[PDB]
Structures are given as structure tokens and as C-alpha cells.
Amino acid sequence: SHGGTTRGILQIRSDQQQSQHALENFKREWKSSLSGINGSWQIPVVMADDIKFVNM
Amino acid sequence: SHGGTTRGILQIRSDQQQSQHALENFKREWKSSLSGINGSWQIPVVMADDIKFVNM
Amino acid sequence: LNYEYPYHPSGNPKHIDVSEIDNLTLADYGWSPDAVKAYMFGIVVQNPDTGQPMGDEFYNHILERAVGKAERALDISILPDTQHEMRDYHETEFNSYMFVHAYRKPILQVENLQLQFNGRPIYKYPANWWKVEHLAGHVQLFPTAGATFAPQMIRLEYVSGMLPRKKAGRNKPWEMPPELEQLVIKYALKEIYQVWGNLIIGAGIANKTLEVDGITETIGTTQSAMYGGASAQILQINEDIKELLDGLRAYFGYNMIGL
Amino acid sequence: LNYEYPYHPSGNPKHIDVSEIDNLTLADYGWSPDAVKAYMFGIVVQNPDTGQPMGDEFYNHILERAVGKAERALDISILPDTQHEMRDYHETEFNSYMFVHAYRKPILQVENLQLQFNGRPIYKYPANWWKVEHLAGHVQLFPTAGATFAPQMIRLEYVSGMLPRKKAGRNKPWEMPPELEQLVIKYALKEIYQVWGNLIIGAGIANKTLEVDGITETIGTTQSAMYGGASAQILQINEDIKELLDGLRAYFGYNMIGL
Amino acid sequence: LNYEYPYHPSGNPKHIDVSEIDNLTLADYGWSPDAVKAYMFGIVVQNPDTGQPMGDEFYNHILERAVGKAERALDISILPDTQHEMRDYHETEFNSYMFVHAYRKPILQVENLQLQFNGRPIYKYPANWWKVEHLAGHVQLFPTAGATFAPQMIRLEYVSGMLPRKKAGRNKPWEMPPELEQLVIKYALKEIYQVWGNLIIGAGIANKTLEVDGITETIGTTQSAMYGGASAQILQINEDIKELLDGLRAYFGYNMIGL
Amino acid sequence: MRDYHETEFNSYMFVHAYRKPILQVENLQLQFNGRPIYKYPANWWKVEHL
């Protein structure tokens, strides 16, 4: 009813944070490539300097 | 039907990546020496600077 | 609504005429020898023995290569050009509203989009279906109404590039950012400084003394057996480039693909 | 209540006239050659051979590019401009009171907001429903009364930018912070100092002595084979920039998106 | 559709005539002694005892080896050449639309493709089936309609290489990037600077003083017991090479193979 | 104009001002499309200035 069920945060890090526009079209690439049953077994390749996932 | 069943990536690393020709005749040495029942218990010796296997 | 057919004003508005793509020149973006000289105000580069100044030909050469370097440094298309792509069918992205990522970005406009078989159009999508996101390089369809992939089914023709910005300090997503111009300037300037750093003194001179008949002159110079005459300026320009590239690689996003 | 239609005084108060966005200029924000000269009190930059001082053209050029650098350094819109965005439908955020994040911030005002289909308005939301958070760049609706996403369903027109602050020492969330002006000044100043640092002495000179008929003059300088003539000032300006950017990136928040 | 047989306009468009591959020369790509001299504006290389300048023979030699170095530094073919390959059958890639990766890239065009047995053509694939991706170096078939490998079943003849770019600042995927030219230039320049750095002063001289009858002359030079006279320039050129190679190794992809 | 959040609204209508210190509170209202739904009596307002 009220909780945060969020599993965790995907930390991507570079010299500066991406602009909101860049991040929103990255969200579009993500959902258009990986969401639902249609995307279910594909793996994204990403070339950020470092990537971390924090379990909450 | 759609997934990547790929167990992992064999990372070989040296001062520079091999040319495509070199890599394809390395694939020929590999399959001609190690594939199927015929190769089944042989172990390759490789002298790259470092070799790593990432489990996916 | 009435419009020139492909350029439906919501999904694919016309931003350039296919005649203007021939008329644009480097000087229209402010990339000119005078701009470089402005950044080297109070300096002149001239042949020490011949006295002739360095000609603008070398400047324009350096600028064209600086634009090329900038276009690979950021995965972008700067000068307008017509792109013709044959793109692979992939089932996941085809189900995702026929998602295709263009190889070159920004999109100025999409010119054609077809599903084909041996060059035969199997279907031509109505232009009112085309959804374009210009800076992203994304095209999608939103229809009004035995293998997971196959090669080169989709034919996509479009113009990539940027237009010179129309207002001071501001750019639309299809307009050039004000400081990408300055980045290209800095790249040119770094080569011009490498040339100039040879000529402040005779070749290879790092100290001189002359004494004649009670007159003495002695000059020390920024050249040395380690540092060239413009080492300092080049270092500074490299710092500025670093900051600029950080900002612009924050403006354009991280590249990604799903496998 | 009576108001100019879109500008409901609680949810979307009018902050600028759509004619004023054309009338504003850099000098209205205090970015002027005189401001730079003020920060270079007691220095003059002049062509070593021609003696003429450097013209205001270069000042205004540098200022426009410094504003561009600042606008990418912080993910903000400084000078007022009219923004037209086509935004994707996503079910999670559409259920969250029709949440949309603008690409550009601050919002000066929202001009139009519609849900459409092939350019056909499906619904036009009453302006009394529009909820705007100006500095965040957030818009929401609080109505008075087959896929999880779809492209470009939402049409949003708004003005992004900042107004010059109306009181000394103070700014509203849509007004420019007093020291973002100084940050842009510092960016300009760094280029003017890079140019000027070539001219303190003849080109490439790092020591000189002249002796004639028992009269001697000798000058050592802050130039060296490593550091250019204005290294110190540039370093200091970089420090000031660092502090200012820390403060302003505390004022503007971290970017985030939900996937 | 009608075309010269192999050059199906969708899958294998003609980019060069097999007679033109003889007519192209290094100078057509701008690699010329004059270009080097341009990058050494204000320097002249001449025999210290004989006075004669260094001949263009050495320039062209160095340029050809710089092209060779560039072609191995990036796994690419620059100058057009006719390639004849015998390729292994592998079941996984043969099932994948007869996927083959060429040893040399870009593909300008495919000239022949056959499956054979002791030189006898077992099948000749219709040219309308050939799917070529030029910059990738990939060839596939899209048919219109006891072991995992066997040696040399597939006979593939094609032309690899790049054409000189037709527009300023722009290149098609089969055209040379403007700054790969500059990379080859920089390599040549680096060799010419290594030659020149011996001759700026007499052999082994790093300081001199001469005093005669109350006249004194004294020269310090960029030579030293550590650094040769052009150390600085070579270091700078190495930096530029590093940046260029970063960009071009981002333009061309990572090599991969499936085992 | 401040968002309603259930947790903090239940916590004695807690709101954190964007700007601090508070010299004084001038008005505090719950509203709907600019119509005051309720105006809280000024004797209810509790301010912590710093």
C-alpha cells in the first residue's frame, strides 16, 4: 500500500551526470529493447566507465 | 527460442587485439584441436598476457 | 492538413531543403581563419627566412580535419549530409514499434522508410505514421490503422547533421551547440600553435647571447630541450578541450544496444 | 478569477510576455565588456604592433560561448527560449498524475499541453488542471472534473529560461542566481587571460637583457618553459569556478529516471 | 531492375570500376611531400655540407610506410585492392544466412562468391541474393527462392579498400575519414622530424661559445645528452596520434569471434 | 505551493520550507484550484524558525 518495493539502484557513473534528455532517450532505448516478454532474455551492452547495482 | 544460452565470454588480452585473420585461424586451430568427442579431453596451452572467463 | 508529403509537421517536420545542404559552408558555422587569428590576437605566423605569412589555405585544411576529429570524438554528424541505410530486421525491436536507431545523429529529417525484398517495396509506411526523435537518432512507427533476425530488410534514407544556431546563446536540438564551434576552434588552434612554436626563434635555438663593440643582447625563450615553444598553451587548450568534451558527452548520451 | 487564459495565477502564473523573450539581451544580465574590464582593472589588452585595444567583438563572442559552456555545465536553460516537446507515453508516469519531466529547466511558464493522435487533439487539458514546479521542470495534472509505452502521444509547449533578478542579493526560483553571472564572467575572463598572457612580453620571450654603452636593462618574467604568463590567474579562476559549480550543482539537483 | 551483373543496386552497389583501382595513387588521398612541408612550415631540410634539400623520394618512401603502419594499426584496408579468399565452412555461421566475415574491410564490392569442390563450382549464388555490409566487412545471403567444419569450401573474391572522400568534412562508410589522412601525415612528420633533429647543429653540439678579440657569440640548443633536437615535437605528435587512434578505434569496432 | 504527502501530513501537517530561516509565517492554507478548502486558524501555527 505504501512501501518502496524498489529492488535497488543501478549506479552508472562518468565525469558528469547525463542531461535529462540523454537519460530519457536512454530510457527509450531501454524499454524498446528489454521490456516485457518481448525483451525478456536479451542482455544490454553498456560501455560506461563503471556500473554498480546497490541491493536495497 | 529467443535467449542467449551463452555460458560466458573468454577474455584474452594483450597489448593489442589480434587482426580478424589471425583470430579466424586461431578459431581453426581451436576447432581442429578441441571440438567434439575427438578433442574432448585435450587442454589448450595459450601464452597470452592474461586470460579470463566471465560467467554470465 | 497540407504539407510536402514526407514532412508531416508532427512526426517529421521539415528543417532543411535538399538544396540548402549544398549551400552550407564551414564559414557559415563561424569556422574561419580570422576566428583562429582572433584567438591568436597579437601574433602573426611567418616564414623566418622568406617573411611571407602563412596562407589561409593551411588554416582551412586544419579546420576541415578538426571538424573530422570532432565528428569522431563525439558520435555525431555536424555538417548536413544525406544518409542511406539498409538496416537489419530484429524481432525484439521490430515488435517495439519498429524501433530503429540511426547510425548517424542528429536527424535533421527522415526522407524515406520502406520494408523491401530484393529491392522490391513490400510496404511503404504512410508518412503520418513516422515518429522521429531528432537528437536521439530514433525512428518509430505508431500505426493509426521462422528466425529472430534477417538481413537488410529495412531501407532508411534520412539527412543527418546540425544547422547553425539562429539565436545567441541558444540552440534547438537540430542546431549546433555554441561551444562545439569553440571545440573545433581549439582543435585547429592546437595545430597552429604547434607550427608557431618552431618559429619564434631560429630553428632549435633555446638561448642566445651576442656581444659586439660594447653592445650586448641576450634572450631566453620558452623553448627547451624538453618543452616546445607552445607547450604551455597546448596544455591549457587540452584542459579546455577536456572540460568541453565532458560537457558534450553529457549532452549526448551513452551509447547502448540490446543483445 | 480573471487572467490571461493559460496563466492561471496559482498553478501557472505568468512570469514573462512572449514578446519579451525576443527583447532580452546579454547586457540585461550584466554580461558586458565593461564587466570584464572591471575584473581586469588596471590592465589593457592591445595589439603589440598596432597599439589598438582589443575590440568588443571578441568580448561578446567569448561571452556567448561562455554562456553556452555554462548551459551545458549545468543542465539548465539560461536565456529565455520557446520549447516545443513531443513526449512519450509511459504507463507508470502517466498514472502518476500525468507526470512529465521537461528536457529544459527552469520553466518560466507552460504555454500548451495536449494529448494527441497523428496530430489530432484527443483531449485538451483545462489550464486550471496544470500544476507546474518551475525550478524542477515538473508538470502534473490534478483533474478538477495494449502496451506499457507509446511514442510522442503528449504535446507540450512551454518557455524555459531564467529572468534577471528583481532585487539586489535575492532571486526567485525562476530568477538567475547573482553568482551564476560571476561564473559566466569567470569563464570569459579565463579566455581573455589566455590571449593576454601571450602579449606581456614579445612572443616566446622568457628572459631578455640589453646592454648598450654602459646602460643595462634586464627583465625576468613569470613565463617559463612550463607555465604560460597568466598561469597563476587562470589557476585561481579555475578554483573559483570549482567552488561556484559545487554550489550551483547543490542548488540544482541530481538527475534521475525510473526504468 | 537492370544492372551490371554482380552490382545489384541494393545488396552490392558498385562503388569503383576494376580499372580505377590501378589509377588511384597516394597523392589522390592528399599524401604528398607538399603536405608534409606544409606541416613543417618555416623549416627546410638540407644536407649541411652539400646544401641540397632532401628529395621527394624519401618523402614518398616514408609516406608509403606510414600507410602500411596505419593499415596494421587499425585492422583495415586503405588503398583499393582485389582480394581472393578461400573460407572455411562452419555450421553455426553457415546456418546464419551463410554469414562470413571478410579478412579485410571495408568492402568496396563483392566480385564473386561460390561454393566449390576441387575447383568445380558446386553452386553460384545469384547476385540478387548477396547482402553486403561495407564498413562491417560482412557478407550474407538472403535467398529469394556430418561435421561442424570442413576446410576451404567457400570461394570469395572481393575488393577491399577506401575511396577518397567526395565532400569536405564528410565521409560515407566506404570513404576514408578525413583525419586518418592526418594520422598518416603525423607518422610521416614524425619520421621527418627524427631525420631533421640531427642536422640543426653540428654533430653532437649541445652548447657552444666562441670569443674572438672582444666579440662573443654563444648558442644553446634544443639538443642535449638526453633529448634530441625535436624531442618536444615528437612527444606532441605522439599525443595527437593517441587521440586520433582512440577516435578511430571507436569508429571501427572491437574484433570478435565465436568458438 | 507544497505537495501533500500522507506520512508527513499525518505528522501534524509537517512541512519543511525550501528557504530558511523563517522570519515569520504569513499565510497557510489548504486549497483546490486556488479555492481555499480550509484556512487554519493562526493560533494553530507552530513555527521553528532556524
Resolution (A): 4.0
H or E element that contains D141: strand D138-141
**What counts of helices (H) and strands (E) characterise chain C?**
6, 10
**Alpha-carbon gap, residue C186 to C241, rounded angstroms:** 7
For residue D217, CA distances in Å to D201, D210, D213, E214 come to 14, 6, 12, 21
Q: Determine phi and psi for A28, rounding to 5 degrees.
A: -70, -45
Q: Kindly tell me the burial class for residue F41, based on how many C-beta atoms sit within 10 Å of its own C-beta (0-12, 13-18, 19 or more).
A: exposed
- Dihedral Cα C32, C33, C34, C39, nearest 10 deg: 100
Cβ neighbors of E53 (< 8 A, separation 6 or more) are: E44, E45, E46, E47
Q: Are B2 and C259 inside 8 Å of each other by CB?
A: no
Residues 10-49 on B with a CB inside 8 Å of E are 10, 17-21, 23-24, 26-28, 30-32, 35-36
Q: Please give the grid coordinates belonging to residue D233.
A: 590567474
Which 3-state string (H, E, C) describes E184-237? Answer: HHHHHHHHHHHHHCCCCCCCCCCEEEEEECCEEEEEEECCCCCCCCCHHHHHHH
CB of D174 within 8 A of CB of D163? yes
CA within 13 Å, CB half, D4: 11
Peptide bond into D106 cis (omega under 30): yes
Q: Which of B7, E98, D90, A41 is nearest to C92 (CA)?
A: A41
Alpha-helical runs (H) found in E87-211: 91-95, 178-196
Question: And the C-alpha cell for C10?
Answer: 508532427
> Would you call E105 exposed, middle or buried from its count of C-beta atoms within 10 A (0-12, 13-18, 19+)?
buried
* Contact assessment for residue D255 and residue A18, using Cβ atoms and an 8 Å cutoff: yes
Phi, psi of E94 (to 5 degrees): -65, -40
Backbone angles phi, psi at E159, to 5 degrees: -105, 125
Report the distance separating Cα E64 and Cα C231, nearest Å: 30
Query: Which helix (H) or strand (E) segment is C62 a member of?
Result: helix C56-73
Among all chains, which residue has been given the C-alpha cell 528543417? C15
- Alpha carbon distance C172, D84 (integer Å): 10
> All 3 cell numbers of residue C82?
544525406
Q: Answer whether C207's CB lies under 8 Å from C221's CB.
A: yes
**Alpha-carbon distances of C73 from C82, E251, F9, rounded to whole Å:** 21, 9, 51
Long-range pairs for C59-63: beta carbons < 8 A, 24 or more residues apart:
C59/C33, C59/C188, C59/C192, C60/C26, C60/C33, C61/E38, C62/C188, C62/C191, C62/C192, C63/C26, C63/C31, C63/C32, C63/C33, C63/C36, C63/C184, C63/C188
Cell of D173: 526560483
Q: Which of D174, D165, D184, D176 is nearest to D64 (CA)?
A: D184
Backbone φ and ψ of E155, nearest 5°:
-105, 120
Q: Say how far apart CA D258 and CA A24 lie, in whole Å.
A: 9
Q: Residue E76 is inside which H or E element, if any?
A: none
Among A23, A32, A36, select the one facing D257 at the smallest CB separation.
A23
- H/E segment holding residue D201: none
Element spanning A22, H or E: helix A20-34
The single residue listed with the C-alpha cell 579546420 is: C63
Three-state secondary-structure class, residue D58: helix
Rg (CA), chain F: 11
Residue D200 per-residue DSSP state: S
Q: Which triple of cell numbers denotes residue D17? A: 510576455
C-beta atoms of D152 and C11 within 8 A: yes
* Spatial separation of the C-alpha atoms in residues E216 and E210, rounded to whole Å: 6
Chain E environment of C71 (Cβ under 8 Å): 169
Q: Around Cβ D143, how many Cβ atoms within 10 Å?
A: 10
> Which residue type does B12 have?
I
Count of alpha carbons within 13 Å of E182, Cβ hemisphere only? 28
CA distance C39 to D57: 12
Query: CA E66, CA E59: separation in Å to the nearest integer?
Result: 10
Question: How long a stretch of residues is chain A?
Answer: 56
* Residue D230 near residue D190, CB atoms below 8 Å: no
Residue C127: what residue type? A
**Cα torsion C168, C173, C175, C176: sign:** positive
Shortest CB distance from D226 goes to which of C170, C223, C227? C227
Q: Specify the DSSP class assigned to residue D163.
A: B
Question: CA-to-CA distance for E219 and E209, rounded, in angstroms?
Answer: 7
| Discontinuities after residues in chain D (C–N over 2.5 A) | 145
Contact of D12 with F45, CB cutoff 8 Å: no
Of C189, C197, C159, C140, which Cα lies nearest the Cα of C78? C159
What lies within 8 Å, CB to CB, of D17 at 6+ separation is none
Inter-chain residue contact B28 with E88, CB threshold 8 Å = yes
- In sequence order, which ranges of chain D are alpha helices (DSSP H)? 20-23, 33-39, 56-73, 91-95, 178-196, 231-251
End-to-end CA distance of chain A: 18
Binding site feature residues of A:
29
β-bridge pairing C107-117 and E207-212: unpaired
D209 touches chain F (CB under 8 A): no
The method of structure determination was cryo-EM
D101 sits in which H/E element: strand D100-101
| Closest-CA residue of chain D to C216 | D211
Give CA D254 to chain center in angstroms.
Answer: 17
Distance CA B37, CA B44 (A): 15
Which DSSP helix (H) or strand (E) runs through E251?
A: helix E231-251
Query: For residues E91 and E75, what is the distance between their CA atoms, to the nearest angstrom?
Result: 26
Half-sphere exposure of C158 (CA within 13 A, CB side): 32
DSSP state of E174: T
Give the span between the Cα atoms of C235 and C222, in whole angstroms: 14
Whether residue C98 contacts residue C76, with contact meaning beta carbons closer than 8 Å, is answered with no
Place of cell 549544398: C22
Instruction: Identify the three-state secondary structure at position D23.
Output: helix
A9/chain C closest Cα distance in angstroms = 18
Q: Would you say the C-alpha torsion E47, E48, E52, E54 has a positive or negative sign?
A: positive
Q: In the beta sheet, which residues pair with residue C156?
A: C85, C113
Q: Measure the CA–CA gap between E72 and E76, rounded to whole angstroms.
A: 7
C-alpha distances in angstroms, D135 versus D104, D140, F21?
Answer: 10, 14, 20
Cα radius of gyration (chain C)? 25
> Which residue of chain C comes nearest to E201, CA vs CA?
C204
Given its phi and psi angles, is residue E150 left (phi above 0), alpha (psi -120 to 50 degrees) or beta? Answer: beta
What are the start-end ranges of the H helices in chain F? 6-10
Which residues in A have their CB inside 8 Å of a CB on B?
Answer: 40-43
